[PDB]
Amino acid sequence: QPDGVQIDSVVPGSPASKVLTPGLVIESINGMPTSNLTTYSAALKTISVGEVINITTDQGTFHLKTGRNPNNSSRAYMGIRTSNHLRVRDSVASVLGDTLPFA
Numbered sequence: 001q002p003d004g005v006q007i008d009s010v011v012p013g014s015p016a017s018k019v020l021t022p023g024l025v026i027e028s029i030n031g032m033p034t035s036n037l038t039t040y041s042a043a044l045k046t047i048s049v050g051e052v053i054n055i056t057t058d059q060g061t062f063h064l065k066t067g068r069n070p071n072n073s074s075r076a077y078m079g080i081r082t083s084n085h086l087r088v089r090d091s092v093a094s095v096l097g098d099t100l101p102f103a
Contacts, residue, residue: 001086001087002035002036002037002038002039002084003035003084003085003087004025004026004027004034004035004084004085005025005026005034005035005036005037005040005082005083005084005085006023006024006025006026006082006083006084006085007020007021007022007023007024007025007026007080007081007082008022008023008080008081008082008083009022009080009081010022010079010080010081011079011080011081013067013068013070013079014067014068014070014077014078014079014080015064015065015066015067015068015079016064016065016067016078016079016080017079019062019063019064019065020055020057020059020062020064020080021059022080024057024058024059025057025058026040026055026056026057026082027056027057027058028055028056029043029053029054029055029056030053030054030055036084037083037084040082044075044076044078045075047066047075047076048066048075048076049066049067049068049069049075049076049077050065050066051065051066051076052064052065052066053066064078066078067079
């Protein structure tokens with residue numbers, strides 16, 4: 001159930017390091033609402049490095065500059081750990097069994 005993307009944590013190397021707060025929820029980007037993980041990516045794929053986007057959150061609307069791509073080269077690298085924050089439940093994945101062939 002995608003229901004918005006939330007900010008997990010803010011690490012250095014991003015312009016957002018002193019712009020937003022970790023723990024906040026991203027409601028929508030400029031003309032592009034991010035209720036899902038894919039829509040977040042679909043928006044991100046159009047943004048360039050050094051470009052500034054408009055992000056409305058619970059804590060208000062902020063303007064964010066795309067990061068400078070640490071460790072990896074891509075377009076628009078936010079730099080903050082972000083996730084849709086899946087609703088906690090117990091969908092257990094029990095071990096079925098592993099068949100071991102003997103040669």
